[PDB]
Amino acid sequence: MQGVNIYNISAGTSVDLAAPVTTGDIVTFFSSALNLNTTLNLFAENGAYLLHIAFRLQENVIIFNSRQPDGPWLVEQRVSDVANQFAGIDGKAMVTVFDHGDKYQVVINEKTVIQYTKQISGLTSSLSYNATEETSGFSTVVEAVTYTGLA
Amino acid sequence: MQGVNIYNISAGTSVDLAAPVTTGDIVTFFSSALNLNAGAGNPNNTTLNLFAENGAYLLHIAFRLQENVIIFNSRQPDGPWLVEQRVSDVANQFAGIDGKAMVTVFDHGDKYQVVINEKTVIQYTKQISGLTSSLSYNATEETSGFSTVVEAVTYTGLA
C-alpha cells in the first residue's frame, strides 16, 4: 500500500529501503546545507547504479549516469549551470526523483532538471549519499523520504 | 505533469496552491518542533487544513493534546462541522521521531490517507469531494505543538 519511509544518510554511507522504489514511486533528498563532491545514488539489488547524480561544482555541471554492477560508466547526460537549478532557495535544497518506468524525472527544488531515459531498469532497493564522508555542497546528513506503493 | 511545489506556511496563515492537489496527489507538512504537552492550558491550536476553492474544508486535521486525540473532519463553506473521525493516543502516532514531525496526506479519490511520519493513522473517507486549491496550518498566532512555521511540499500531476 501507499506508504512513507524516512531515512537519514550521512555522507559516505548507504541505506537499504524498507519499501522498494519502483514505477510510480518517488524519493526526495533533503539537504540542510547548500554551499556551491556530492553524489546521490539509487541502487538495484544486484548492486547496479540505477541512477547516479553527481553535482560538479568545479565544472559547474550536474552529471547523470548509470552503471552495471561489474561494468563501467555508461552514457552520461549533463545539465549546465549548477547554481541555476537551486535558484530560488538559499542555505538548503531538495532533490526529488520520480521513477516513471521508462525514465527517471529529476527535480531540484521545484525545477525539473532532466527526464533521464533509463540505461538500466529494475527496482531501487537501496540508496546512498556520498560526499566522500567529507560533505561538500550539502549537509553531512541527508534525509530521504520515499513515497512507495503509488501505482 | 508531475511536479514538486514548496510552501512556507506560518501559524495563522494560508497559501493558495500553484498546482492543485487532486486524486493521486500528495502533500506533506514538516514541523521543526514537536511539543505534545498541554504547555499552557489549551491543547487545541495545532491544525492542518486542505481547502476547496469554494472555501470548503476538504480535510481538517486537529491535534488535541489535552484530550489526547487526533481529530479528522470536513465542513461545507456555509455549514457546520460534519461527522468527526478520531484517533486516540496522539503521542504514540509520532512515536519514533522526537523534536520534529511529518504529516502526509494522500488524495485517493474517495478518501484521504493520513500518515504521521511513517505510520498511517487513518483512511478518512471523504465527506466532501473536490480538488485542494489551498492549505493552511493553524496554531492561530501561537506555537502549539509544531514549529510556528510549517514547510509544505506537494507532489502533483501523478495520476
Range of the domain at A24: 1-151
Q: Which residue in this structure is represented by grid cell 512556507?
A: B8
Q: Supply the CATH number for residue A25's domain.
A: 2.60.120.200
> B124 vs chain A: nearest CA distance in angstroms?
14
* CA A46 vs CA A70, A72, A130, A135, B15: distances in Å: 10, 15, 19, 27, 44
Asked if B93 is an interface residue toward chain A (Cβ–Cβ < 8 A), one would say no
What the block records as the C-alpha cell of A13 is 554511507
Cell of B20: 492543485
DSSP state of B58: E
Q: Give the nearest partner residue to A6 out of B24, B118, B120, using CB atoms.
A: B118
User: In Å, how far is A65's CA from the nearest CA of chain B?
Assistant: 22
CA distance B158 to chain A (A): 8
Contact A3 B102 (CB under 8 A): no
Q: Count contacts between A and B (CB, < 8 Å).
A: 49
φ/ψ of B91, rounded to 5, equals: -50, -35
A31-to-A12, A60, A124, B2, B158 alpha-carbon distances in Å: 15, 19, 21, 22, 24
Do residues B91 and B46 make contact, with C-beta atoms less than 8 angstroms apart?
A: no
Number of domains composing chain B: 1
Q: B155 and A147 in contact by Cβ < 8 A?
A: yes
